[model samples]
Target chain A: DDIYKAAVEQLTEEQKNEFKAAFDIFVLGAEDGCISTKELGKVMRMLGQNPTPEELQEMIDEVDEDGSGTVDFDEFLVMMVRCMSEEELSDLFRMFDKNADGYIDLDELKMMLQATGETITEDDIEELMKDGDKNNDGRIDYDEFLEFMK
Target chain B: LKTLMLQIAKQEMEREAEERRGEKGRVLRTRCQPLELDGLGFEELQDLCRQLHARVDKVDEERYDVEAKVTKNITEIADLTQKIYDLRGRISADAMMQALLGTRAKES
Candidate 1:
C-alpha cells in the first residue's frame, strides 16, 4: 500500500500525462470501460504471449480494487505502475536519453522536460540530477530512474 | 394412437431442434423426418411410440441440467482448444522466458 501510494505520488506531471495518454489508448480499446480476465487472455494472445485464463483471473482479482472481478482504468493504472520492471524502464529511459550515451544527462532531461511543456526550474533539474543520478555522477540511468521514480 | 405418437414424435424432434437452435434463433427448417411405422399393428406401434418417446423424453427431462453441463463442457473445451493453439503457435517456445528470466514490464 505504501509503495503503491508512493509510486502514484512520485510520478512527474509529465509522466502522469504520458501514462494517461497511453492508458487512453490501451484501456479505451476495451469496451464497457473494463477489461475482463477472459478478454485479457485474448489480448495477450494477440500480443504473442500465452497468458493463462486462470492466471489472468487471479491477477484481475488481485488488482481489482472494487470487488468487480475485473480491471478498470484506475486499477489498471495501479497495476502498471506497480508491475513495470527495469527492462521496460530502460526502454522508457532510452526514449528520453536521445544521445545513446546510456544515461539521461542534464541536457537530455531538459529536452525531455521541455518537450512536455512542463516548465521545470534549474533548481528542480539539479535536485533531480542529484537524487535521480544515484551514482553521484549527476545523470539519470535506467536503474537510477527507477529509484528516482519510486 | 399412431397419430398421437407420430405427432408427439414430431413435436419432440422439433422441440429438440428448437432446443439446439434456441439460443441461435427461431430456425426455419425445424422439422425431423417421420418414423417408419409400416408393418407394426396398433399395439406394436403404440409400444414403439412409448419407446421412442421414452428415448426422447428420458433425456429431454434433464435438458436444463444437461444443457448446463453441455455449456460447461463446451467452455472447458474452448479453453483447452486455445491452449492447443498456444502450443501450435510456439508462443511460449522458451519455458524460462514464459516463466521468468526476463525484465517483465507493464504499461499504465
Candidate 2:
C-alpha cells in the first residue's frame, strides 16, 4: 500500500492531487469507502478497457487484502503504482535506447541527457561506459539498462 | 488507412460519451438521488461536449502510450516468470554442477 505513496513521490503536487481526486470519484459510490469487485469492473469499462469479468476479478485478487474481496484506497493505489511504473519506465527505456538497434550506447545516453538540457562531458560518458558496461563492449544492453533503472 | 483512422475516431467519441456518463453516474450515486443541470444553453452543452471530447482524445493518446509499453512489459513479465519457475524448480543446473563437479573440483 505504501507503493502508492512511493509512486506519487515522482509526481508533482498538482498531479498527485488530481490522481487522488479521480480515485475519490471512484470510491464515492461505495458505502464502505472501498470499491467492490463489481464496482472495479464498472471502472475498467469506463476507462474503455472492457476487461472480462474474470480478468477484472483476477486484477482485484492480485491486490486485495484481508479476504474481503474489495480494494480499499491503499490497495487500489498500490495496484495503480505497479501498473504506472511499467507504463513510465518502459516508455523511458524505449526513448533512451534511441536507435532501433536495441542497445543504448554511451552516445545515446549523452544525446538523451543533452536533449533534456543536461550537459555532460565526454569524460562523464567514459565513466558511465566503464560503470554500466558489463560486457566491456562500450555499450549497455537492455538487461544492463534494466539493472541501471534500479 | 482511412478506415483505421475512422474507426479510431469513432472509438474516441464513444470513449468520451462513456466517460461522461460514468461521471454522471458517480455524481448521482454520491448524492443518493437524481440531479440535473437546468437552463443550460445549446452553446454551453456544445462546449461541454467539446471539452469532454478533448479529454477523451488525451486519454486515447495516453492509453496508446501505455499500450505500446504494455506490450514491452509483457515480455518482461515472461522473463520474470521464467526466473520464478527456475528458482522454484526441484534442482537447477548450477546446483547440480556445484554438487556433482564439486565446489573445489580437483580435476580440471
Candidate 3:
C-alpha cells in the first residue's frame, strides 16, 4: 500500500515548494483567532508575485466589506467561509482516506492514483508517504490527515 | 403585515412562474434542473443526498475535463514560445557570424 510519502515523491520540486509555501501560509493565518484581510493579501501576494492592478483589485474586493477599501479579520473569515462548504470538506477527507480504515496509508494512495490513471513516479509517491507518516510508525492516522489538511 | 405578506406571496408566485419559463428556455437547461427535495424524511433526504452527490460529481468531472484541456493548451503555448526564442537566438548568432565573415573577406 502506498502512503503519503509516496504521493509527495511524485510531485516536482517546484510543485512541492509551491504547495509547502501556500500550505504554510494558510496554517499560519488560520492559527490566529481569525485571519486578517491584510494577512490574506500577504498570502495572495506570496502565491502570485507582481500581480496586475486588476488582479490586486480583485483580491482586495474578495475580502473587502462595507466598501472601506480594506479587509479586517471578520471580512477575511467571511471570504474563507465562502470558499469551501461542509460537504466539500467532508468529501475531501473521504477521498484522502481510501481504505475507509478511518485513516490513510501509502498503499491506499497508490491505489487511488492508479485508479485515477495518474502516472506519478515512485520517488514522488515515496516522498508523499514519508511526509504523511507523521507518527513514524509508517502509517497515517486521523490526526495525520487533519494535520495534512490543515 | 397583511399587505407585506400578500406582496411576498405574489412575488414568490411570480418567481415560480419565471423559473418555469426559464426551465423551458435555454437557461435552466444549461444548468442543473433543480431537484425537489422538500418534505423529505430522513431516508428520503439520504437518498436525495446521494443523488446530489452524484450530480455534483458529474459537474466536477466536466469542470476538470475543461481545466485539463486549458492546461494542455497553455503548455503548448509555452513550448511554442520557447521554440520561438531558440530560433531568434540562432538567427541573431548567424547574422553576427555572417557580418564578421563579410568584413574579413572585404579586408582580404
Candidate 4:
C-alpha cells in the first residue's frame, strides 16, 4: 500500500521501484563506510530529490560487484568515474584533495570528519592511514585516500 | 503518472520563472515551459543531477576565470588613463609658462 501510495502521489510505480532500488544500495554502501551520507545527500539534492532506500539499493546493485553488500572506497571511485566524464571525475578528486598537497593526508581527513561533527581517535586515524597508504610512504596519497572513501 | 509529471513540470517552470525575475528583474519573463524528461525515473534523475552539477561546476570555474581577467584589464585601463591625464597637465603647464615668458611658438 505504501508503494502504491508513493507511486500515485510522487512517481509512477516503475519509477518508485527504481528509486527504492537505488536508495537501498545507497544506504547499504553508507553502512559499509563505502560512501558518506553527506555525499549521497549532496548528489541527491542536486537532482531535486532526496535519497530513499530504494535509490540506494539501485546504486549498490550497479556498482557492488563483490556481492559484499558494501562498496569499498576504491570501487566507489571507479563507479563514479565510470558514471561521469573525465573532467567531472577530476573535479571531484580535486575537491577531496584539500590543502592542494597533490594528495590527501590524515589531517585532511580528520578535518573533513570534524566538519561533519564526527570525532575519531588517533588509533582509528592510524589504522586508516595504514590501510589506505598505497605508496607506503607513511602517508595517504590521492589514490590511497579514495580507497578509504569506499 | 502523466498528471504528476505535469504538476512537477509546472512547479519547476514557476520556480525557474521566479529565479529569473530575481536575477534580471521583472523586465525579463521566461517564455519556456518546465523541462520535461522523457522516461525519467529516480535513477535517471540522480544521474541527471550529477551531470548537471558537473556542468554547472565547470561554468562556475569559467566565470571566476573571466572575472579575474576583467578585473586585471580594468586596473590596466585605470593606470593608463591616469598617466594620460598627468601628461596632459604637464603639457598645459609648460605651454602656460612659455606664454608668460613671451617665448610661446604660437598664440592660443
Candidate 5:
C-alpha cells in the first residue's frame, strides 16, 4: 500500500475529511497538484501559527523528499505524522499492538485490517508482513513500525 | 432651657439631613441629581472622581482592543481576497495553455 493509503487508514472519518479538505485548499491554483511554500505558509497563518519563512522551508524540505520543493498529499501526510506529538504516536503504537507484546504481530495486523473493514487474503497479509519487517524478524518492532507509517 | 433649645435645633438639622438623603435616592433612581456633592468632603469627592476615571479607562481599553481586532481582520480578509483572485487567474491561464497545446479544445 502507498503512504497515502496507510496514512488515511490511521485517521478517523472526520479526521480524514478535515485533512483532505485542508489539503485541497492548500493546493489551489497549482497545476502540479502540490503545495508551494507560499501556499503552505498562507495556510499556517490562517490557522494562526505565524510560522517564519525559514520554518516553512525547513518543513517542506524535510517532507518533500523528491527534491520538488513542493509538497503533495503523500508528503503532507508524512509531514503530519512528523508534526503529531509523541504521545499520539505512542497511542497509535498501543492501538495496533493489541496483545501487549510491545510488537505488532501478524495476528494484530489481521485485527487492524479487519477493524478497517477490509477483506484481506493470506497473500495480502504476507505482503504487509514482508513489507513491515525490515529486519526480517517475525514481529514488527516499534522502529520498523515507525518507518512503515512514514 | 438654653441647652434644651440647642438640642431641639440639632435634632431639626438632623431630620432635615435625613429628608435630603431620602430625596436624593428617589432623584437618583428617577433621573440625575447633583445633591450628593453637597455632602461630600474633599477626599470623598476625589474618590468618586477616581472611580469615574477608572471606568472611563476601562472602556477606552476595550474600545481600543476592538478596533485593533477589526484592523487585523480587515488585513487578513484583504490578503485572502487577493489570493483568491490570483488563483482564479491561474486557473484560466492553465486552461488556455491546455487548449492551445491541443490537450483540450477551446470553446467555439
Candidate 6:
C-alpha cells in the first residue's frame, strides 16, 4: 500500500486528477464501482494497446491480487505504477526537454511551464526550477528529474 | 294360444335387434368417410375413437413444449440486451476520456 501511495504521490496534482478521471471512464454506467475484464480490455484498446484476450486476463490477474475479478481506483493506481516503466518516464522527459540536448534546461522548463498556463510568472518558474534541480546546476538532468518524480 | 303369443314375441325381438344395428350404422356413416371405416364392428370403432383421442393429447404436448421454449428465448434476449446497454454506456465514457486526454497524447 505504501509503495503504490508513494509512487502515486510523485504525479502532479493535475496529473493525479487526470488519472482518477481515467479510472472513472470505465465505471460510468456501472453500479459495481469496479472495472471488469471487459472494461479493462476496452480502455486498453482505446489507448492503442489492442491486447488479446489472454493478455487482458493476465493484466486483471496481476492487478486484482485481492481476487475481486475487477479493479477499483487504488488497484488502478497499482497498475499505473507497474506499467509506467522507465521508457514511459523517458518519453515524458524527452517531451519536456525540447532542445534534445540531453537535459531540460531553464529555458525548456520555462517553455513547458508557459505551455501549462499563462498564470506562470518569474517567481513560479524560479520556484519550480529550484525544486526540480537537485544539484543546483541550473539545469534539470534525467537523474534529477527521476529523483523529483520519485 | 300360448304358442301364438311366443311366436309373436320372437318376431318383435328380431325386429328390435335389426333397429339397433341400423342406428349404429347411421352413426358411423355420419361421422367420416365410409370407405375407411366400412365393415368395422362396434368394438373396433370404439378402440379407433380412443386412438384418435390419444393422438390429440400428443399434439397438445408438442404445442406446450414450443410455448415453453419461446418463453425461455424471451428471457435470454432480455438479459443479453441489458448487458449490451451496459457495455455501450461504458464505451461512451471511454470515448469522452480519450477526448479529454487529447488525440496527441494517445498518438505518443
CA shift of A97, model 1, Å: 49
lDDT of 1: 0.64
Candidate with better TM-score, 2 vs 5 = 2
Indicate whether candidate 2 or candidate 6 has the larger TM-score. Answer: 6
Worst 10 residues of 5 chain A by lDDT: A80-89
CA shift at A128, candidate 3, in angstroms?
Answer: 0.6
lDDT of 3 by residue, A24-90 (tens): 4444745343334555456555544455556656765866757755554445433333343233234
Computed on C-alpha atoms, the DockQ of candidate 4 is 0.01
Give, for candidate 3 chain B, the lowest lDDT window spanning 10 residues.
B90-99
Candidate with the greatest lDDT versus the true structure: 6
**Candidate 1 residue lDDT tens string, B1-108:** 123333543464445445656755544435444578889998998899889888797667788788999999999999998997899592321332223223331221
The TM-scores of all predictions, comma-separated, are 0.31, 0.31, 0.25, 0.25, 0.31, 0.32
How much is B77 displaced in model 3, in angstroms?
53
Q: What is the interface RMSD of candidate 2, in Å?
A: 24.9
Worst lDDT 10-window in candidate 6 chain A: A82-91
Q: Give the runs in model 1 whose Cα sits over 4 Å from its true position.
A: A85-150, B1-108
lDDT of 2 by residue, A1-150 (tens): 333455645656554444455566567778888777777767666555577778877887888877778887667656656564333345556777877787888778888757756466787677666756777888887666654543
Each candidate's DockQ score against the native complex? 0.02, 0.01, 0.01, 0.01, 0.01, 0.01
Question: What lDDT score goes with residue A95 in model 1?
Answer: 73
DockQ of 6: 0.01
Q: Any idea what lDDT model 2 has?
A: 0.64
In TM-score terms, which candidate is top? 6
Q: Whole-model lDDT, candidate 4?
A: 0.55
